[PDB]
Design a protein around this ligand. Sequence first.
Ligand SMILES: Nc1nc2c(ncn2[C@@H]2O[C@H](COP(=O)(O)O)[C@@H](O)[C@H]2O)c(=O)[nH]1
Length: 186
Amino acid sequence: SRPIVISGPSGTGKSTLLKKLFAEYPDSFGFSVSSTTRTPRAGEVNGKDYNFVSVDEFKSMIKNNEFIEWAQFSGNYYGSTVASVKQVSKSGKTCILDIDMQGVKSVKAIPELNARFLFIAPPSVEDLKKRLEGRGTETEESINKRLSAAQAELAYAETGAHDKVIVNDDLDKAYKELKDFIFAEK
Ligand SMILES: Nc1nc2c(ncn2[C@@H]2O[C@H](COP(=O)(O)O)[C@@H](O)[C@H]2O)c(=O)[nH]1
């Protein structure tokens, strides 16, 4: 039951690594489903990817102390709840939290959770830029901000804040590392 917090910039293939994990070990791990006020994307199931809540409900959740941690990103709110983590743990599975660097810093400050920290790094920031540009979705201005956030995360990883850093420069290789880390148990 030590929760594993996984973080890393989007574009690293991080969702595919976890997709594989939950495919191979469906009865061993439970995902912490965060609440968010952003709008759902095609493919996302409310209650599975996120619990999509209004701003009035997310404010009520803040005032009633329902979060382990919460942040804002691009004007929308996101947070991990006490009740989603508690339900996975009482099911008897290992809780996995997929959160950003602000979320990592916050859970670091909660000794009680006793979490493990795994960071999934891009091959390099230049490579991340190529993937984000190759998607065609982002603008010059959002990509620049994402690269600046990924540089801040890599500098924070060199303080020794995570228990393990995986460089995802090949999915199957990073997936073998991820399972080696996890099933080591501590
Ligand atoms: N701190 C924190 N960050 C989160 C949480 N859920 C998702 N994030 C993040 O906020 C960003 C946006 O996620 P997206 O909108 O793509 O699903 C990503 O950096 C992702 O890691 C949460 O519960 N807490």
